[PDB]
Amino acid sequence: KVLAGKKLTDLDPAEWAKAQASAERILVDVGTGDARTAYRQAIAHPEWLVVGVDPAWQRMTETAVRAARKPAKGGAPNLVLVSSAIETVPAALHGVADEVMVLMPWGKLLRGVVLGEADVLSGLRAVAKPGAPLEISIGTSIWREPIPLEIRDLPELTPETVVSTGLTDRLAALGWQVADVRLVPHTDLDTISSSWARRLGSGATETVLHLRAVAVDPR
């Protein structure tokens, strides 16, 4: 269930309850990578319960080590790294998110987002409270060669194609009322995708497709 160092242990239902009650706000990152991005949201907002959810738990191990240390040594006790896929999220993670974030997704998470697949979008909808925003950010440079296999068979997602492909309708039918979709050129990449193999301040930027939606009633 939950990362505790380099070992994943079980999270006591009670402790998971107190942590929720104790938090000003709950933020859920689906698809976290090595989870440095989730770690920094936790450091910047110690009162947020930041929850990183992703099946590939071995990659979040270093983040978990650094987060387990004492406060003065860069520890972050408000960071919860959950080992789970979004398509079959456990019932304890149902309706907890004040905000759901999908920051530069890869693999199935990325493909399900571009295609508007029921299992990914409903899993994302399952974790959110009514009114909670869905923030999806995808770097557009994934559509230059070589285009990643998980999306190589699709056309480039633009603000205009999001509507004409019916993605905006599939989102609304699954409980996601789209509010805004736009391209933001020259976006500092360190804002939505940190990494322990990357140094902050490199100033690397990219064009990023943003999509905000709000959790409503499914059809």
Residue numbers in the entry: 8 to 226
Sentences from the paper on this structure:
However, exceptionally high-level aminoglycoside-resistance is achieved by the action of intrinsic and acquired 16S ribosomal RNA (rRNA) methyltransferase enzymes in aminoglycoside-producing and human pathogenic bacteria, respectively. These resistance determinants block drug binding by catalyzing the transfer of a methyl group from their cosubstrate S-adenosyl-l-methionine (SAM) to the base of a defined target RNA nucleotide within the ribosomal A-site. Here, we describe detailed structural and functional analyses of one of these enzymes, the kanamycin-resistance methyltransferase from Catenulisporales acidiphilia (‘CacKam’). CacKam has a SAM-binding core fold comprised of a seven-stranded β-sheet with a central topological switch point, characteristic of Class I methyltransferases.
To assess the relative contributions of these two interactions to the observed β6/7 linker structure, individual D21A and W203A substitutions were created for further functional and structural analyses. CacKam-D21A had an activity equivalent to the wild-type enzyme as determined by the resistance conferred in E. coli to kanamycin (MIC >1024 μg/ml). Crystal structures were next determined for each CacKam variant to assess the effects of the D21A and W203A substitutions on β6/7 linker structure and crystal packing interaction. Despite the loss of a potentially important crystal packing contact, CacKam-D21A crystallized in the same space group as the wild-type enzyme with essentially identical unit cell parameters and crystal packing arrangement. Critically, the CacKam-D21A β6/7 linker adopts an identical extended conformation retaining the double cation-π stacking interaction of W203 with R43 and R73. Thus, only direct disruption of the interaction of W203 with R43/ R73 through the W203A substitution is sufficient to induce changes in the β6/7 linker structure and the crystal lattice. Together, these structures indicate that the R43/W203/R73 interaction is the major driver of the novel β6/7 linker structure observed in the crystal.
